[PDB]
Amino acid sequence: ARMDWKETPEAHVFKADLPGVKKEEVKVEVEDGNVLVVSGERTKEKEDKNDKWHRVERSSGKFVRRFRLLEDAKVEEVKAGLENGVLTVTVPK
Amino acid sequence: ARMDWKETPEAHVFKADLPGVKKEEVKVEVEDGNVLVVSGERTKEKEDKNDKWHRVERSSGKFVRRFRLLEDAKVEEVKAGLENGVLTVTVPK
């Protein structure tokens, strides 16, 4: 899962490309008090044998991403939005 | 634009991971009767000019892709939808 890490005067913002992932398959947490953990699964659409695959380039499966936040970050004020296959996490400073 | 091409008995289904892309930035055309063409370019995020970029992995650009259909497609029957970062092009056989 490709992620960007930008910083605004107000907060550190994280972005993650998660095409084809429903919000029920993504988990956003804070472990050990200051470690942002973005994880989930990009479910494989196995389907039936009637089908035929001519090309397969898209990946599927589990993904895990961890960033170490500041020992003094609004851990209780972290927001997480998901739209158009892009996840956005806002960690207030 | 990682893409998959599946051939169910009913139609040809193409998938393209285009996270954070808006329909005004993607284009699905048909050339010479049997050539599906997918192209586009994710726009610059009109996000806070001045932000600090700690890490940038998501780095998309222009691209064009073409597939040779097994049979001339009835262009008025071709459906294309964009959702959760995934472009889907269905071609009825």
Side-chain angles (χ1 to χ4, degrees), chain A residues 3-19:
Chain A
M3 294 183 75
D4 289 328
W5 173 20
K6 297 189 181 69
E7 190 186 317
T8 65
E10 303 84 321
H12 291 196
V13 185
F14 307 80
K15 294 284 187 182
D17 288 334
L18 297 176

Side-chain angles (χ1 to χ4, degrees), chain A residues 2-8 17 19-20 42 47 51-52 54-58 65 84-86, chain B residues 2-7 15 17 20 47 51-58 60 65 84-86:
Chain A
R2 303 198 310 185
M3 294 183 75
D4 289 328
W5 173 20
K6 297 189 181 69
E7 190 186 317
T8 65
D17 288 334
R42 208 287 194 60
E47 295 149 30
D51 295 16
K52 193 176 183 183
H54 295 300
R55 189 74 171 190
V56 190
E57 303 174 2
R58 305 199 308 146
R65 281 303 225 132
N84 300 300
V86 177
Chain B
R2 302 299 186 62
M3 289 180 68
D4 293 315
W5 177 357
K6 171 182 63 181
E7 187 187 316
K15 283 293 201 308
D17 283 337
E47 296 176 6
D51 282 326
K52 181 182 175 182
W53 296 352
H54 287 277
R55 190 189 186 99
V56 179
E57 301 178 347
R58 313 191 307 120
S60 300
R65 299 264 260 157
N84 290 299
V86 177

Side-chain angles (χ1 to χ4, degrees), chain A:
Chain A
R2 303 198 310 185
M3 294 183 75
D4 289 328
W5 173 20
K6 297 189 181 69
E7 190 186 317
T8 65
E10 303 84 321
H12 291 196
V13 185
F14 307 80
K15 294 284 187 182
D17 288 334
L18 297 176
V21 182
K22 304 194 186 73
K23 47 175 166 55
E24 285 58 50
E25 301 174 297
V26 176
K27 183 196 288 184
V28 182
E29 308 179 309
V30 179
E31 294 171 352
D32 311 305
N34 68 323
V35 178
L36 172 52
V37 178
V38 192
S39 62
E41 204 172 11
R42 208 287 194 60
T43 309
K44 180 68 176 181
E45 202 68 5
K46 293 200 176 187
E47 295 149 30
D48 18 296
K49 295 185 179 182
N50 259 319
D51 295 16
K52 193 176 183 183
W53 296 87
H54 295 300
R55 189 74 171 190
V56 190
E57 303 174 2
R58 305 199 308 146
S59 58
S60 66
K62 296 176 178 298
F63 60 77
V64 189
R65 281 303 225 132
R66 308 168 186 289
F67 287 76
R68 179 142 269 155
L69 309 179
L70 300 168
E71 269 285 56
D72 83 311
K74 293 292 188 174
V75 173
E76 271 59 52
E77 293 177 54
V78 179
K79 308 107 60 57
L82 179 59
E83 172 176 51
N84 300 300
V86 177
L87 180 65
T88 301
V89 178
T90 321
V91 182
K93 299 160 63 182

